[PDB]
Amino acid sequence: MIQRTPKIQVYSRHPAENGKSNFLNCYVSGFHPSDIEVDLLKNGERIEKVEHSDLSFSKDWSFYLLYYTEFTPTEKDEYACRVNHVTLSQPKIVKWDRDM
């Protein structure tokens, strides 16, 4: 058996075909087992509709999850990714850097 802690990246992108749109992305990578809980938070509160969740694996040992949704951020609001996994003794909260 193997277990691997997820790596978590939080970042924003504008789709080229719709440059005014802005997406907040969670990239949760390299984890095992696949059982996982992932939320986007806005001001400590969970975001309800998250347009997309794309799950894949490399070889059998490793999963990859892209979690993302459109958003309109102000300089006041705060966004984060919360991840819970059996490898983590406490839920991992990764804040969005407004420069990324």
List the one residue out of 53, 47, 41 whose CA is nearest residue 96: 41
DSSP state, 14?
-
Fold of 1-100: Immunoglobulin-like (2.60.40)
Find tokens 């003794």 and name the residue: 89
Encode 32-92 in three state secondary structure.
ECCCCEEEEEECCEECCCCCEEEEEECCCCCEEEEEEEECCCCCCCCEEEEEECCCCCCCE
Q: Give the resolution value in Å.
A: 2.1
Q: So where are the chain's domains?
A: 1-100
In DSSP terms, 27 is beta-bridged to 9, 66
Method: X-ray
